[PDB]
Ligand binder design. Sequence first.
Ligand SMILES: CCCCC/C=C\C/C=C\C/C=C\C/C=C\CCCC(=O)O
Length: 152
Amino acid sequence: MDAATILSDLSTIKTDINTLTQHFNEFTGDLLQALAAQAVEQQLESDIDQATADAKATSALSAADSTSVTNALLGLKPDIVTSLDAIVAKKPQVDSAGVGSLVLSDLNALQSKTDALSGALQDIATATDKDTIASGTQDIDAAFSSAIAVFS
Ligand SMILES: CCCCC/C=C\C/C=C\C/C=C\C/C=C\CCCC(=O)O
């Protein structure tokens, strides 16, 4: 509903991602581990959708708020790349657990939901910040495409 809400929403997303990465780095193929990570992944999906809804409810951002939201979104990029790298690194464990289709389903959902979030933030950012967001989102989308290719 306002810029502070969107920033808080983006921080929650950041926390979710870093928690997932921790799960990935511990994954041994065990299905209970997979269940635990999927719960976090589903929380992440919900949190991204919440951010999108809050952004859709928000008026054209001041210059300072636009910078804040742009930097918070772009600040997710290395966390996303790190997280995607971490699950890719565990492809053998994913294959042995037989849960590749779940990873793939999750990746496609997350890409869709993240793209929607970026679109909504572009809509309320300054003209310059929109371009910056779009550019960073291209990079996030590239990273998703690579992970999807690995898991399909
Ligand atoms: C918005 C940025 C997205 C960052 C990447 C986040 C998730 C990658 C997608 C799916 C992986 C998560 C759960 C799938 C379930 C089991 C696979 C092993 C999980 C584990 O380790 O037990």
